[model samples]
Target: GVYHREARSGKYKLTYAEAKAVCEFEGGHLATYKQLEAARKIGFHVCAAGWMAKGRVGYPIVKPGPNCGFGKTGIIDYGIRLNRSERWDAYCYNPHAK
Candidate 1:
C-alpha cells in the first residue's frame, strides 16, 4: 500500500535521502509520481507534500477545501526541490510482501 509518512522530528524536516530511507525501512521503496497519481486518482488524499521518485514533491487532494492547495484537487506537483537538505515529507510505495 502506498503511504505518506512524515518525518520523525515533525513536518518538513527530513532530507531527500532521509525520506527515501523512511520508505525502505517500511519494507517498501520510494514512490513515483505516477504511482502517487494513481493513488490520487482513486481518492488518495493526504494533504501533504513529500518526496517522490527522481526528486519530485507532491501531495494528493481529493475533496476541494480552502486550506490545502488553495482548494485545488488532484496531485499538487512541487517539482524537484532545489535542496535535498530541505525539510519535507516522505511517500512510500507498496509493502512488497512475499
Candidate 2:
C-alpha cells in the first residue's frame, strides 16, 4: 500500500535524496507512479504532494473540491520538479505491510 509521509517539523521539508532515505528508513521505498495510482483508485486522498520515484511529485484526489487538488479528479500530478532541493513530502510503498 502507499502511505504519505511528512517531515518532523512539518510538511514541505525534505529533499529528494532525503525523501528517498526517509521512506527506506521507514522500511519502504518511494512509491512508483503506478503504485500511487492503484492506491488512489481505492480512495487514497492526501492534499500534500510528495516525492515519488523518478523525481516526480503528486498527490491523490478522490473527489473534486476546493482546498484540495483544485477541484480536479485522479492524481494531481505536479510532474517532475526541476528543483529537487525544494522540500515537500513523500509517498512510500510497503508491499510487505498490510
Candidate 3:
C-alpha cells in the first residue's frame, strides 16, 4: 500500500510526460514486476504496468541507445492529462536527445 501511494504521488505530482520520463531515466520504467516484488517483500504494494520494454533477445540492434532513435521505449502519453487510472495511459518516457 505504501508503494501504491508513492507511485500515485509521483504520478499526480509530475506532469504526464515527466512522470514516465522520470521513471525510465531513474531506471527502466514506472516499475517492473521485479521492482514491485521487491517492494512487496519489503511490505510495500506497488505494481509496474510494463509501460516500458527492454530489448528482447537477438534484438540488440533495435535497442535504444544514446541517440534515442528508432525502437526507443517511450510512453505513448496520448496527451491525456487524466487517464492514468485506466490502463494504457499516455506518458512520455523518451529522453530528450542531446
Best by lDDT: 2
RMSD of each: 2.0, 1.8, 14.6
Q: How far does residue 63 in candidate 1 sit from its true spot (Å)? A: 2.0
Q: TM-score for each prediction? A: 0.84, 0.86, 0.28
Give candidate 1 misplaced runs (Cα > 4 Å): none
**Poorest 10 consecutive residues of model 1 by lDDT?**
89-98
Clashing pairs in 2: none
lDDT of each: 0.77, 0.79, 0.32
* Best model number under TM-score: 2
lDDT of 3 by residue, 22-65 (tens): 55554434443344344445653212222322311011122344
lDDT of model number 1:
0.77
> Whose lDDT is higher: candidate 1's or candidate 2's?
2
User: Any runs in candidate 2 off by more than 4 Å, and if so which?
Assistant: none
Q: Candidate 1 — which pairs collide?
A: none
1-98 per-residue lDDT for model 1 (tens digits): 67677888897887778998877775778877888777777767777778887777776677777866688767788688677777778888866722
lDDT of 1 at 58: 70
- What is the Cα-based TM-score of model 3? 0.28
